[PDB]
Design a binder for this molecule. Structure first.
Ligand SMILES: [Ca+2]
Ligand SMILES: [Ca+2]
Ligand SMILES: [Ca+2]
Ligand SMILES: [Ca+2]
Ligand SMILES: [Ca+2]
Ligand SMILES: [Ca+2]
Ligand SMILES: [Ca+2]
Ligand SMILES: [Ca+2]
Ligand SMILES: [Cl-]
Ligand SMILES: [Cl-]
Ligand SMILES: [Mg+2]
Ligand SMILES: [Mg+2]
Ligand SMILES: [Mg+2]
Ligand SMILES: [Mg+2]
Ligand SMILES: [Mg+2]
Ligand SMILES: [Mg+2]
Ligand SMILES: [Mg+2]
Ligand SMILES: [Mg+2]
Lengths: 133, 128, 130, 130, 128, 130, 130, 133
């Protein structure tokens, strides 16, 4: 597929069709990828600038017993270093039912919690694995 | 309301949810949507289900869309072929990427769209 | 890789060279496999009969903070259903240092815990792919 | 334990007793941690300066049938961005037997591959989780 | 080599081509991949085909992926349901958007990927 | 729209108001239909029996440079198989001006050509949608 | 015919005899042409200047169950880019019976909808095909 | 679907996956569209500038008895006014088997004939039909 943008050792797909969070993950896995994690300011900047005004699912979901946030790609979640990327006042767990996260605002403070069963465009991340000629 | 069988507890829900919302329900209860790895466990499940459809932990994984178990039990294509309803998985509409227990038989499983809501079964390990 | 034996949807490799548990694991992963799990009586039977009274690393290892036993292939470990597959009195954690497990006796009570850095022959399991 | 050191959302344990790579990773998992991953220059610099010229196992290990490097804490391994962190000429798979990695040189270019069965001090990592 | 039947001529090719390359072959011969609109024409085709698979003018059209005829004969869902192999069209792999004559029966049609190569049948009208 | 009669996968509307051929066509298209084609004997039978000995525009019209007859619904026109459905001696092109066709006689030899701008009742055909 | 006029890859016939919209379109099809479409300002200007203040049927006709305008030569009708070409206030469907369109006013805003059964001179178009 | 760009009363989809010419058409029809026609310089400019260096099928195909070029959307083909949009020396009917057309060069002279059964990205065109509020 076209549509995979390179950045710092990964490729990033910004979908054209909207899915629920899990259906989006399943499309990523079928493409040897996962909904993206975000572990730096420069990655966050890529995603929000590319996103423009459109809302995209990323790999953020609740998991374990205390519903701590987690990344579907299994990156260990760093709550300290992730606090800077939430919209102010998010996560707000609107109606006690917002257990997945998307990029919503055009700022490094971009993430919002939303219900997993809601449909949005999504971002996949696929590793690049070079090899010496 | 958990039912005990062979080292696990099983929760047959009362409320329907999508496949992933059921899976997060189970993870909040220290469990996962159930795997099925023996004819006796298939039989416990379809006898308990009383003819109603329940999501189980079957979902697709990889580019080739091989089936997998959300609890990470390796999925055995050969030993489980017998556990599908004849004709399934049929991938209806190109959008059936999760599995449920449907027919009261060893040949019980169907593929269904993951965003459909059904009752669901969690499996929690008993650790004495 | 040759010398794989087929049973119920998996192939099994019985090594002829001893490794530590982890290095055994590494060898299996280089052959697209894992040290084997054991999840039914017929599989245990295959494995101890095949082993021929010789000792092999299997995929048993402690994990998490309670040191509960686990499978390195990520099969959920069923403690109740596996209790019958340990040699009586195992796992005894000799020296407080036996954090891996092997097939040691030719019996359905076959398994012993042993130190991970001891070297034994090992059993890999690989899924049959159609 | 008293001696966990804090940086950027994670705590680090520098061991005082040497272990094989897997026995080190079991000790980290018994402390609710894993052998450490390295995902930025600032983290590599903390680790090699703290190591103070002593060799420590880190979470580098081969995985998959290709033998690509990975992190035992399941952080996706970024081969492009990690190339800066190996000592020049490593991983060199000396002896065809170097399947685990440690912090060896006091430099941003610090890592070596070594036999998993060698004993070295080791470094565990765990995120702060309120 | 054209076979005459009920006001049309029919060409059973000797060379296999994709569905659209066969259709352009037929258009270069003042014809189209055949429509089928009666049991007698179905029967002429599957008896002449001698058990071999031929593309015919069946292809999908609209957002709902209704079948259509390339020669613009309106496609009658009710009168043609009988002309499919039982189970078809099954849309195998999500990529079967053209039709061929496959089984020697009134129940003859299969859906297949349009980029597969088969022999093909053109229909040219006879205008006295 | 009501008053549609079902036969073999289509519905048929027999108007009660006369139009020119084209305006009849327009009316059918506003009801998601076309002036009807006729492609089997049973359909012709339905249509002339229903018409009850009254004259109706059908979808027959000349098109292309030879003035061959055609169907406005784009069914390919089968000249050989339709010859039996014209009244003997039709189409006679009276006045060199009869470029549309109607069902006129209650017989399988039913059709006549007539001028397009004459007004008659008309028959629309609409596919049954499941 | 001698009198076809050429512009931008197409020839145009301005009739001398008036016909209903459909009988005009049949006359164009007997000349290997269609009532004309209009797809640019320069084509509209050629047509209204040539028309010289006389009304001509063009290929505008309703099609589909919604009654959207279309071109009889099957040029996809661009409703956005055609809005400039209607006389202000048209199509006004006078009488609920105006299903065809003609060039009426000598202006870029030229088109009116009129009853298809009205007789007017008409304009045929055909591409040059070497 | 996102990915539909507006221009002069139509929307234009530049695909992310490559198909044969007909399979591309079939995807367009499933989306209530067709492979695009090109009837002006300004439309041609849109397509080649958007395309960049990537090759896309357009609606150009041979049809009728003399294999004249035609548009799949049924726009009548104007050979005079289309001559300016072919790459120099195209169409060349390489190996007597090039019966479909794509946009290839980054110029108003952009079209090339190629075999219909070859796979390329493709462009669909969908009409916009406004209605007064
Ligand atoms: Ca929220
Ligand atoms: Ca199914
Ligand atoms: Ca022991
Ligand atoms: Ca080395
Ligand atoms: Ca099929
Ligand atoms: Ca007559
Ligand atoms: Ca008017
Ligand atoms: Ca060429
Ligand atoms: Cl950062
Ligand atoms: Cl232009
Ligand atoms: Mg997409
Ligand atoms: Mg419940
Ligand atoms: Mg060996
Ligand atoms: Mg220590
Ligand atoms: Mg041939
Ligand atoms: Mg009426
Ligand atoms: Mg005249
Ligand atoms: Mg696409």
């Amino acid at each position: 597929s076209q549509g995979w943008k390179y950045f710092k050792g990964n490729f990033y797909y910004f979908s054209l069709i909207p899915k629920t969070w899990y259906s989006a993950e399943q499309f990523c896995v079928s493409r040897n990828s996962h909904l993206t994690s975000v572990t730096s300011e420069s990655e966050q900047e890529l995603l929000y600038k590319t996103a423009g005004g459109l809302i995209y699912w990323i790999g953020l979901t609740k998991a374990g017993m205390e519903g701590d946030w987690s990344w579907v790609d299994d990156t260990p979640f760093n709550k300290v270093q992730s606090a800077r990327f939430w919209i102010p006042g998010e996560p707000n767990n609107a109606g006690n039912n917002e257990h997945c996260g998307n990029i919503k605002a055009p700022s490094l403070q971009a993430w919002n919690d939303a219900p997993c069963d809601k449909t949005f465009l999504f971002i996949c991340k696929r590793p690049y694995v070079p090899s010496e000629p």
